[PDB]
């Protein structure tokens, strides 16, 4: 069961350092190269660097003077470190496992979910969550005034998936983000069933459950 999972700090101030850990599972890093790839908001995929099975590395032209990738085979972990962070460096960072080939991989097999890194001198703010009150009913949650991205939103602890729309965040004149998640439900179940949105904001460690009522 191959798994890769990135672990970052979420927010980093300009000029300071970034450390992300990829924890790997269902394979041995003695046998597999891993790539690091990144994606600035709204922009294309950028190759960042690689650490070969043997432990040697290669880096991106643009970032290589500030970049270093290392690993712990015994611990199933790969580390990206990066100095002197600029606004530019705001991105989602993925690790990806090497698939196939002898000394050049045929492709990138399996990817982590990514970890989001904002380079900013603002401080961390948890969201306020306000209900959006309701043969089809729409209800929702307004998730407001948090920094930085991301927030994760689910309904009824992940049980209710169908007809959910969580909208992309918007950045307000205040420098804080704001989104809404909404769900379409049967009108008749409004009397019988309860609906809670589960809002999780990892950078501030704030978990909020909100009952949305008629």
């Amino acid at each position: 069961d191959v798994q890769l999972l990135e672990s970052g700090p979420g927010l980093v101030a300009p000029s300071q350092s970034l450390s992300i850990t990829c924890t790997v599972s269902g394979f041995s890093l003695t046998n597999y190269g891993v790539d690091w790839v990144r994606q600035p908001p709204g922009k294309g995929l950028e190759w960042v660097g690689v650490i070969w099975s043997g432990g040697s590395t290669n880096y991106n032209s643009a970032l290589m003077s500030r970049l270093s990738i290392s690993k712990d085979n015994s611990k199933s972990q790969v580390f990206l470190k990066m100095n002197s962070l600029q606004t530019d460096d705001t991105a989602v960072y993925y690790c990806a496992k090497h698939w196939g080939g002898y000394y050049i991989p045929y492709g990138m097999d399996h990817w982590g979910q990514g970890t989001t890194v904002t380079v900013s001198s603002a401080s961390t703010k948890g969201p306020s969550v306000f209900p959006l009150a309701p043969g089809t009913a729409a209800l929702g949650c307004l998730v407001k005034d948090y920094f930085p991205e991301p927030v994760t939103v689910s309904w009824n602890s992940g049980a209710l998936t169908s007809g959910v729309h969580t909208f992309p965040a918007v950045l307000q004149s205040s420098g804080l983000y704001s989104l809404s998640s909404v769900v379409t439900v049967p009108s008749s179940s409004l009397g019988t069933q309860t609906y809670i949105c589960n809002v999780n904001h990892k950078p501030s460690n704030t978990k909020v459950d909100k009952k949305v009522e008629p």
Partner: protein, 216 residues
């Protein structure tokens, strides 16, 4: 330093039609060992990149036959026969013959389906929000096609400007529709100063503009 040039940037395609994506490399990507290490990746909305094609034309396991890569030297092509709703996202080529490896710019596949009118809902500020000094009026346009849609706010019939924000979802992977939210933000004072709040919506699938409203 190898550059990968992907065109077009955006590729609108009807369901069931063919889609052709082009990757050109500034030099040959035939490795000294005779292999040419060119991959194609799909990144769907809210998902990590997934491998489709490796070494120019080999399908990755679990990738359907509608997907085929071809080309050699500098000119390469990804072809998707009978485009399905699930094929929606951004395709990237990848070159791995030369250090440093690079992705192309990306090509966004939008799906062309039949017109679908939005369902409109309006939400008043929550009592919890008012009881802290800010009013957010939310207007939701659910499951529509095409993406172009006009949402206007009227406060006691005063057409509002500068005081609202829009957010549109990515295209839905099951039915190639968009949803949109427009949020009108007022201080509690300025909100409790007015009676009728109206979201007015214009769209190709509607026969005339639909209005959702409420009295505070």
């Amino acid at each position: 330093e190898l550059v990968m040039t992907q065109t077009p940037l955006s590729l609108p395609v009807s369901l069931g039609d063919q889609a052709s994506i082009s990757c050109r490399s500034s030099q040959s990507i035939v490795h000294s060992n005779g292999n040419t290490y060119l991959e194609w990746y799909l990144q769907k909305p809210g998902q990590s990149p997934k491998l489709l094609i490796y070494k120019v034309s080999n399908r990755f396991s679990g990738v359907p036959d509608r997907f085929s890569g071809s080309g050699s030297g500098t000119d390469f092509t990804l072809k998707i026969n009978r485009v399905e709703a699930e094929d929606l996202g951004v395709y990237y080529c990848f070159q791995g013959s030369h250090l440093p490896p690079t992705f192309g710019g990306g090509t966004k596949l939008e799906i062309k389906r039949t017109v679908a009118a939005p369902s409109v809902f309006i939400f008043p500020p929550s009592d919890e929000q008012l009881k802290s000094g800010t009013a957010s009026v939310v207007c939701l346009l659910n499951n529509f096609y095409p993406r172009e849609a006009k949402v206007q706010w009227k406060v006691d019939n005063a057409l509002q400007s500068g005081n609202s924000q829009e957010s549109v979802t990515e295209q839905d992977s099951k039915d190639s529709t968009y949803s949109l939210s427009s949020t009108l933000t007022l201080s509690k004072a300025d909100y409790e100063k007015h009676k009728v709040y109206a979201c007015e919506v214009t769209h190709q699938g509607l026969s005339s503009p639909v209005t959702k409203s409420f009295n505070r």
